[PDB]
């Protein structure tokens, strides 16, 4: 009399929601197809 009443499962298995603030939103991403990426900066300025 209990083999007749199987329960009902949810439609999708749900998970704990984790934050998605990544610092990728404010930083700059660059599409690079190579082993690495270099940047060229100026640690000093000119003279007048």
């Amino acid at each position: 009399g209990g083999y007749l009443v199987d329960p009902q499962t949810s439609e999708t298995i749900r998970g704990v929601l984790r934050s998605t603030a990544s610092l990728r939103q404010i930083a700059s991403v660059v599409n690079v197809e190579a082993t690495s990426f270099d940047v060229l900066v100026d640690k000093t300025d000119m003279g007048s």
């Binding site: 190579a34 082993t35 690495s36």
Partner: protein, 48 residues
Amino acid sequence: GWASETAALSETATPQIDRITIPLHELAAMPKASQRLLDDSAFDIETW
């Protein structure tokens, strides 16, 4: 034979046959390359 004119030519030899088998082996090489290298290494490493 150097057959004569009236000689009643008899049987002559026949070349015998030898069969030589060439087992046709195989020769295997298995180099391992990193997938990171094959994408970052502008020289075609596949064909190299």
